[PDB]
């Protein structure tokens, strides 16, 4: 076939269905249902011809769905296959093939609903650090593009309901790998850190930390959803095993936050626990040791 463009021709609505009672209206909180208009005219396109919808800053679909049909009055005019950016790419793609129903004489139009979670960060990975600059709190334009034809809508996104000066955590499922990323950022020491020890563990067997997929770094502040925006070098020593990842660090400069992340896998991804080392001394002298445990039962 040949590549055609302009098939997706409108961004009709982008509406949040907060399906896990999240306390803030975040881009990376499920689900943002995107309703797009399309049209197919037998004068332009042919069976076999393909087209691609480019979706910047889209992490994944929120359902098990991997295919979406361009259907109109109960007849299917195109098959599309969704490819999620996850930790592979900053964008997601919908790749569509015109079906044998679009003969020369057919003129068709319809809509499609896409169940979205946007990527605004969550780890020290290259994909997340780049996508940490995707949106801001407040009004945002979301633009997809099929070829040169751009389709856009304005949406309002809410900064987190969590004080960024505290310790921070995150978890998000990577559906294709059946794996979960998890983040831990130390509490803020405004004028820098003399020392600290941080990390997380699960010593009970049913959760595995994957030491081949970790990040350790200092970030120069955080974005509007409390995720890292940079990952610089700093003085620390790491231990990692399937049971936990820990770092002891020193002399982090004012304005930075040390963080660690890792993929995890669990026998119940919808219900597992992690226990945290949370000890630090701020430059100036303010000391703290406040370990804790979390039950993870929502993931983004």
UniProtKB/Swiss-Prot annotation:
- Give the subcellular location: Cell membrane; Secreted, Cell wall
Posttranslational modification, per the record? The GPI-anchor is attached to the protein in the endoplasmic reticulum and serves to target the protein to the cell surface. There, the glucosamine-inositol phospholipid moiety is cleaved off and the GPI-modified mannoprotein is covalently attached via its lipidless GPI glycan remnant to the 1,6-beta-glucan of the outer cell wall layer.
Traced from the root, the source organism's taxonomic lineage reads:
Eukaryota, Fungi, Dikarya, Ascomycota, Saccharomycotina
Name under which the protein is recorded: Agglutinin-like protein 3
Give the intrachain disulfide bonds: 57-134, 80-96, 189-282, 211-240
What range of the full-length protein does this chain span? 18 to 316 of 1119
What is this protein's function per UniProt? Cell surface adhesion protein which mediates both yeast-to-host tissue adherence and yeast aggregation. Plays an important role in the biofilm formation and pathogenesis of C.albicans infections. Necessary for C.albicans to bind to N-cadherin on endothelial cells and E-cadherin on oral epithelial cells and subsequent endocytosis by these cells. During disseminated infection, mediates initial trafficking to the brain and renal cortex and contributes to fungal persistence in the kidneys.
Family note: Belongs to the ALS family.
Q: What is known of its domains?
A: Each ALS protein has a similar three-domain structure, including a N-ter domain of 433-436 amino acids that is 55-90 percent identical across the family and which mediates adherence to various materials; a central domain of variable numbers of tandemly repeated copies of a 36 amino acid motif; and a C-ter domain that is relatively variable in length and sequence across the family.
């Amino acid at each position: 076939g040949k590549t055609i463009t302009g098939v997706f021709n409108s961004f009709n609505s982008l509406t949040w269905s907060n399906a896990a009672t999240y306390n803030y209206k975040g881009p990376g909180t499920p689900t943002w249902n995107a309703v797009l208009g399309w049209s197919l005219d037998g004068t332009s396109a042919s069976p076999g011809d393909t087209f691609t919808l480019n979706m910047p800053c889209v992490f994944k679909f929120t359902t098990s769905q991997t295919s979406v049909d361009l259907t109109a009055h109960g007849v299917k005019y195109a098959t599309c296959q969704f490819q999620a950016g996850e930790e592979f790419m900053t964008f997601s793609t919908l790749t569509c093939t015109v079906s044998n129903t679009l003969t020369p004489s057919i003129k068709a139009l319809g809509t499609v609903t896409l169940p979205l979670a946007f990527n605004v960060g969550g780890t020290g990975s290259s994909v997340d650090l780049e996508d940490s600059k995707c949106f801001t709190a407040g009004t945002n334009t979301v633009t997809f593009n099929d070829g040169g034809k751009k389709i856009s809508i304005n949406v309002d996104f809410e900064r987190s309901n969590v004080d960024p000066k505290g310790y921070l955590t995150d978890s998000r499922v990577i559906p294709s790998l059946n794996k979960v990323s998890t983040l831990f950022v130390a509490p803020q020491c405004a004028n820098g850190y003399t020392s600290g020890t941080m990390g997380f563990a699960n010593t009970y067997g049913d959760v595995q930390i994957d030491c081949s997929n970790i990040h350790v770094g200092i970030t120069k502040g955080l974005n509007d959803w409390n995720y890292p925006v940079s990952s610089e070098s700093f003085s620390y020593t790491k231990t990692c095993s399937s049971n936990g990842i820990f770092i002891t660090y020193k002399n982090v400069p004012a304005g930075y936050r040390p963080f660690v992340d890792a993929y995890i896998s669990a026998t119940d991804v919808n219900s597992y626990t992690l226990s945290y080392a949370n000890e630090y001394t701020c430059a100036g002298g303010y000391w703290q040791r406040a370990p804790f445990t979390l039950r993870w039962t929502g993931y983004r």
